[PDB]
Design a protein around this nucleic acid. Structure first.
Ligand code: ZN
Lengths: 148, 148, 50, 146, 148, 348, 107, 49, 66, 50
RNA sequence: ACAGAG
């Protein structure tokens, strides 16, 4: 595998401060299996997300499950079996800031990871044991499938 | 007989003076559905700082006027109102605020924003670059001080 | 208009020109377009060497 | 051309030559040549009643027809080609949400008005050959280099 | 649905209240998930049709279906700028005594359209002030005004 | 022998507006000969000269000596004079239609497919950039559609080829920052440029313009050298017109027309404010007025009236800006700071 | 005289080259770019006018694999020519069909 | 005051130090009442663009 | 001075409509009916006749003659 | 008191305002001069504040 | 000596 993180997320709010943009919506989500809160921008024109939807979000280091990190360039035209065939939405971006929780003065374990998908931001916040394998200046694939 | 070139000063009856900066062919102008392309393209950036709202109304009153054979009055503290000319434009099938669906002449694809289109009175000013270009290499000198 | 201000501290100079200015964004910021009519007049003395 | 008074005289001699319109605008053969994509105004919900009349006045005078089906007025799109898109359906507050003003992308409606030099069916045929001629010229230079 | 939104996005220019959307052309290979947008001459020759809807003296309206903006705009630009015609370039004036200035009269006579078929004539060479049978026509205007 | 040749491309030539208030009013430029009669220069250099292209005239001087070329080129060159001597702030930077085009490009709503990404980027491939391999970045969105977010296209200004060494870094507050987001703000107004890639935030006057520091061209100047700043400015001057002229950007009478939500609010404010003034009129002429300390009773009345009348403008002003939509062209120019202000919008 | 000049990118063995189409403007540029972008072996394609005073366009092509960019460019010219050949045959058929119908009516 | 236009009806029989004329002048499409009092729309200075 | 031969914006020949336009205004058409009867659909052509001043009809009095 | 048909014999324009002289062939206007009213008691402050 | 222009 080349998976960093994987969990099922439930959408809890769609626009906290109003609809600032047409195509983009700021999804605030919470995970069942782990206590992870998720901020995520998605293009809601190509992929529409509703306030009750439940989706599976995998973050992966490589899009080919055989664990070959060979990415000189990404060719859209090329067709081979990959991980994206199982998922509806895919984004490519870079982890750019790992930051500690400020809200407790002692004995804390929550971490924030920030990923930017060309300006579509993600904050993934949770226990340090679940965010393992994130490093600054690393490039990750988000993958996302809605569940019935 | 002089034809307008780069550097010739034109003005527009509201203090929006401006020198000619580029002359582009008819094939490169943006064009409406009816085939009209502008004689002059004016930059929108002049209006916010200068608040020449009267130019914006003159364009609208004139457009509603040419379409029905009227001269609309622009008299101080009076004149033809926006509410009257808006109803003239929609009767002739144009948008009530003069904005039109404009196609790019370079790419052929349509422009995203609607573009304001109308007839604005433009007056040519006496200041022409041909009467102002000057160069000296060496030449005649004064008699008292032997300097140019 | 006396000697010290008008003719000594500042003075009329040759190899000089003046024209209306107009924009051109396709030039670099270190460049200026000079018209051919000024360029044919404003000469520079190039010393001949190898 | 001119206008005279007695004793005044004009005598001259003209030389007509061939040129393209990129050189000077007196050579262009068209009054205007343009195109527009074709409208397909579609009704998302059925508009009945006296809202059918005010939907037929937010458009050009021949596109929305109001028809009686049971002694009741229902509106349908009839000829969306004649629409000029004045966007009057957005001044109305109740009917912004029942229409989808659009344009078919791959369907153009050319309008070529000639000035009289040669008729416009020959103008389009000549215009297509010019683009064929531009492609032919650079194929010759790829052959000349290689 | 995501698929219904994709189909609108690649086939309809939609007009909003504040701006047009889906303006660009997108049917290129690798822009979409399952679609095969590579060039296929047989698919072009099948879909393309031309319908002439109106024609009379000096006017023509016709529909092209299945061609792209990048080629329809080429036809628009050739008709404006690159289809040749015959027009006056030189005026040889003998005894002009009218109030109309000679430079203005020559400009007016230039803009008169001449019925000569331009395919039968060649381009006049560089220089060559006289010209010949192959590449020039000649007109003579001569008017004397007198009292009745 | 001495040959008095014509002025040719690459001559060092002095260029000067007639009133000079500082040293940057006269700078040295490399000449290029062009057919039309005017002098022409890139509009990023309008701010040092205080030039405005409304029939303005400028002077040109041709130094007649090799020693005068070198002093002009090394000391007075524009690339050596990007910052004013006074406070050390950049003056050669982006201006109107290079700030507005950059702002609209870097907004979160912009997505480009491969054909339009290439056609915006290919504009920069002119001049000395004609030999570089263009480095189209990987797309952001992959599975439903292949989209490039407009921030990536902007980053091609800062690093246009794989061999270019520039690694710019910037982290600053934008103009319309809410103050609590810390890169998660709702306005998308916090700027991060990490390794010459724009990770968040739109580009305002405060990041691409001449006002002050925290400017990415100032970062390039201080961290990578003069030539890198001058290249990026030439790329922005070339790229942003190609976007903006094919997006369309226009102002109309419908962009300054008061909606019904304001006309009710304005009527309430005028009636309330005038009636509060009328009571203080009565309290001066025919009663007690609480005379403020240090002023006479008449003067105390002027400061109360000016208080009421300021409240009317500010409350009516903050009512119009809440009912304006986005893509209102004065509001875009006010937000990015390219021209105008929220006073001007509220005033018209 | 020559209307075409090829300018290879400095590091790249013929897969990146800029084509200076002389005596041209947006008319050929945008149409030819469209046919080249329809080829799945092209990575980047786009044109710029060097200056409004200059009738040049710098058409850049970059290809994915090992193939030289001359081959997409030549295929681009040929397919555009075949499109314009087919557009003409359809147009002239519809004009003749319209004239024949109009002459067959009211007679 | 500086706009090119038409001095008057005697402008062709008039010899002056310097005179500017516009070839095809047009009268304003939007006009004041003051324009009608001074008769500016008889010898106008400008063109509708 | 005299009616321009072509419309500035599109190049339709409006220079032959002038002697007709004045004639129709003697038959008491309105301006907006007179331009519609001559074929001036687009408003850029309409302003050629609507905004024109016939100066040459008045300069030609002062002009010298036998 | 002439009619517009008789201005044409004099080569003059009916709309020409007059109000000016012709002296040695140049048209010269006496401008309106603004003045203070004589025979009026000004009451004003001196430089020294008296 | 006056009027302009920035
Ligand atoms: Zn016209």
């Amino acid at each position: 595998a080349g998976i960093l993180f994987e969990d099922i997320f439930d959408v809890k709010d769609i626009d906290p401060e109003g609809k600032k943009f047409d195509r983009v919506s700021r999804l605030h989500c919470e995970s069942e299996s782990f206590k992870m809160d998720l901020i995520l921008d998605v293009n809601i024109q190509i992929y529409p997300v509703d306030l009750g939807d439940k989706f599976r979000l995998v973050i992966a280091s490589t899009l080919y499950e055989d664990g070959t990190l060979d990415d000189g360039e990404y060719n859209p035209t090329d067709d081979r079996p990959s991980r994206a065939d199982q998922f509806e939405y895919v984004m490519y971006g870079k982890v750019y800031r790992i930051e500690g929780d400020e809200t407790s003065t002692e004995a804390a374990t929550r971490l924030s990871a920030y990923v930017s998908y060309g300006g579509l931001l993600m904050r993934l916040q949770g226990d340090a044991n679940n965010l393992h394998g994130f490093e600054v200046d690393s490039r990750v694939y988000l993958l996302m499938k809605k569940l019935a | 007989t002089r034809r307008p070139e780069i550097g010739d000063k034109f003005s527009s009856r509201h203090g929006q003076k401006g020198v000619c900066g580029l002359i582009v062919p008819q094939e490169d102008m943006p064009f409406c559905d009816s085939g009209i392309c502008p004689d002059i393209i004016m930059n929108p950036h002049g209006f916010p700082s200068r608040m020449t709202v009267g130019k914006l109304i003159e364009l609208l009153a004139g457009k509603a006027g040419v379409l029905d054979g009227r001269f609309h009055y622009g008299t101080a503290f009076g004149g033809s109102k926006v509410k009257d000319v808006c109803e003239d434009l929609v009767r002739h099938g144009y948008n009530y605020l003069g904005k039109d669906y404009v196609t790019s002449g370079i790419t052929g694809e349509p422009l995203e924003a609607y573009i304001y289109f109308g007839p604005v009175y433009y007056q040519k000013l006496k200041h022409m670059v041909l009467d102002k270009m000057h160069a000296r290499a060496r030449g005649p000198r004064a008699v008292l001080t032997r300097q140019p | 208009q006396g000697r010290f201000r008008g003719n000594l501290s500042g003075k009329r100079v040759d190899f000089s020109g003046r024209t209306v200015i107009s924009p051109d964004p396709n030039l670099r910021i270190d460049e200026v377009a000079v018209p051919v009519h000024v360029a044919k007049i404003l000469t520079f003395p190039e010393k001949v060497n190898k | 051309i001119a206008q005279l008074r007695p004793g005044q005289e004009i005598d001259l001699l003209m030389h007509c030559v061939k040129g393209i319109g990129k050189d000077h605008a007196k050579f262009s053969p068209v009054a205007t040549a343009s195109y527009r994509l074709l409208p397909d105004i579609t009704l998302l919900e059925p508009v009945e009643g006296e809202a059918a009349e005010e939907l037929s006045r937010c458009f050009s005078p021949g596109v929305i027809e109001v028809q009686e089906v049971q002694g009741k007025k229902v509106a349908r799109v009839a000829n969306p080609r004649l629409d000029t898109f004045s966007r009057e359906i957005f001044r109305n507050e109740k009917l912004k949400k029942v229409v989808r003003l659009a344009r078919v992308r791959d369907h153009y409606i050319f309008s070529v008005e000639s000035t009289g030099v040669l008729p416009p069916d020959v103008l389009v045929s000549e215009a297509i050959k010019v683009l064929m001629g531009k492609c032919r010229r650079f194929l010759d230079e790829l052959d000349a280099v290689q | 649905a995501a698929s219904q939104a994709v189909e609108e996005m690649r086939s309809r220019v939609v007009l909003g209240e504040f701006g047009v959307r889906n303006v660009h052309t997108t049917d290129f290979p690798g822009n979409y998930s399952g679609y095969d947008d590579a060039w296929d001459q047989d698919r072009f020759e099948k879909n393309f049709r031309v319908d002439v809807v109106h024609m009379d003296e000096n006017s023509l309206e016709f529909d092209m279906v299945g061609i792209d903006a990048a080629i329809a705009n080429a036809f628009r630009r050739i008709l404006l700028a690159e289809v040749p015609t015959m027009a006056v370039e030189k005026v040889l004036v003998y005894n002009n005594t009218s109030i109309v200035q000679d430079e203005i009269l020559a400009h007016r006579l230039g803009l008169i359209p001449i019925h000569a078929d331009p395919r039968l004539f060649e381009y006049r060479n560089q220089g060559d002030e006289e010209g010949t049978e192959i590449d020039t026509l000649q007109f003579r205007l001569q008017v004397r005004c007198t009292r009745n | 022998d001495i040959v008095e040749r014509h002025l040719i491309d690459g001559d060092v030539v002095l260029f000067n507006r007639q009133p000079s208030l500082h040293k940057l009013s006269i700078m040295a430029h490399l000449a290029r000969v062009k057919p039309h009669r005017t002098f022409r220069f890139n509009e990023c250099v309008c701010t040092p000269y205080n030039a405005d292209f409304d029939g303005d005239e400028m002077n040109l001087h041709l130094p007649q000596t090799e020693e005068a070329k070198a002093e002009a080129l090394v000391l007075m060159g524009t690339k050596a004079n990007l910052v004013t001597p006074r406070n050390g702030e950049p003056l050669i930077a982006a201006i109107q239609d290079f700030l507005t085009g950059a702002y609209l490009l870097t907004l979160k709503d912009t997505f480009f497919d491969r054909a339009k990404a290439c056609q915006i980027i290919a504009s920069i491939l002119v001049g000395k950039d004609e030999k570089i391999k263009v480095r189209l970045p990987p797309p952001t969105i992959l599975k439903p559609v292949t989209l490039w977010t407009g921030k990536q296209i902007f980053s091609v200004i800062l690093r246009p080829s794989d061999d270019n060494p520039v690694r710019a870094n910037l982290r600053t507050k934008g103009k319309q920052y809410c103050g609590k987001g810390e890169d998660l703000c709702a306005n998308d107004s916090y700027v991060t440029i990490q390794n010459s890639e724009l990770m968040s935030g739109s580009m305002d006057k405060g990041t691409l313009g001449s006002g002050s520091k925290n400017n990415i061209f100032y970062i390039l100047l201080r961290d990578w050298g003069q030539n890198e700043a001058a290249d990026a400015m030439s790329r922005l001057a070339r790229l942003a017109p190609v976007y903006l002229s094919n997006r369309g950007f226009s102002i109309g009478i419908g962009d300054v027309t008061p909606g019904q939500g304001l006309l009710k609010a304005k009527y309430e404010l005028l009636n309330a404010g005038y009636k509060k003034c009328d009571e203080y009129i009565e309290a001066l002429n025919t009663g007690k007025l609480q005379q403020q300390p240090g002023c006479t009773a008449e003067e105390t009345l002027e400061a109360l009236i000016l208080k009421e009348l300021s409240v009317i403008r500010d409350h009516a002003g903050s009512a119009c800006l809440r009912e304006l939509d986005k893509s209102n062209s004065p509001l875009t120019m006010a937000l990015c700071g390219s021209k105008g202000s929220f006073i001007n919008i509220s005033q018209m | 005289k020559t209307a075409l000049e090829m300018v290879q990118a400095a590091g790249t063995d013929r897969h990146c080259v800029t084509f200076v189409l002389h005596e041209e403007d947006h008319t050929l540029g945008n149409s030819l770019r469209y046919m080249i972008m329809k080829n799945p072996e092209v990575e980047f394609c786009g044109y710029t006018t060097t200056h409004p005073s200059e009738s040049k366009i710098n058409l850049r092509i970059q290809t994915r694999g090992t193939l030289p960019a001359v081959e997409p460019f030549q295929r681009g010219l040929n397919e555009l020519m075949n499109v314009c050949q087919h557009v003409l045959d359809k147009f002239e058929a519809s004009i003749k069909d319209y004239k024949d119908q109009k002459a067959s009516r009211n007679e | 005051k500086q706009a090119m236009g038409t001095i008057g009806y005697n402008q062709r029989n008039r010899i002056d130090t310097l005179m500017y004329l516009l070839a095809y002048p047009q009268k304003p499409m939007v006009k004041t009442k003051t324009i009608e009092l001074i008769e500016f729309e008889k010898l106008p200075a400008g063109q509708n663009a | 001075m005299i009616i321009p031969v072509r419309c500035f914006t599109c190049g339709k020949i409006v220079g032959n409509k002038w002697e007709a336009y004045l004639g129709l205004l003697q038959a008491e058409y309105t301006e907006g009916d007179a331009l519609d009867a001559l074929g001036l659909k687009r408003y850029c052509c309409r302003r050629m006749l609507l905004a024109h001043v016939d100066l040459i009809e008045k300069l030609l009095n002062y002009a010298p003659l036998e | 008191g002439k009619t517009p048909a008789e201005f044409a014999k004099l080569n003059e324009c009916p709309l020409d305002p007059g109000g000016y002289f012709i002296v040695k062939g140049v048209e010269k206007v006496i401008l309106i001069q603004e003045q203070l009213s004589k025979n009026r008691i000004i009451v004003e402050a001196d430089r020294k504040g008296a």
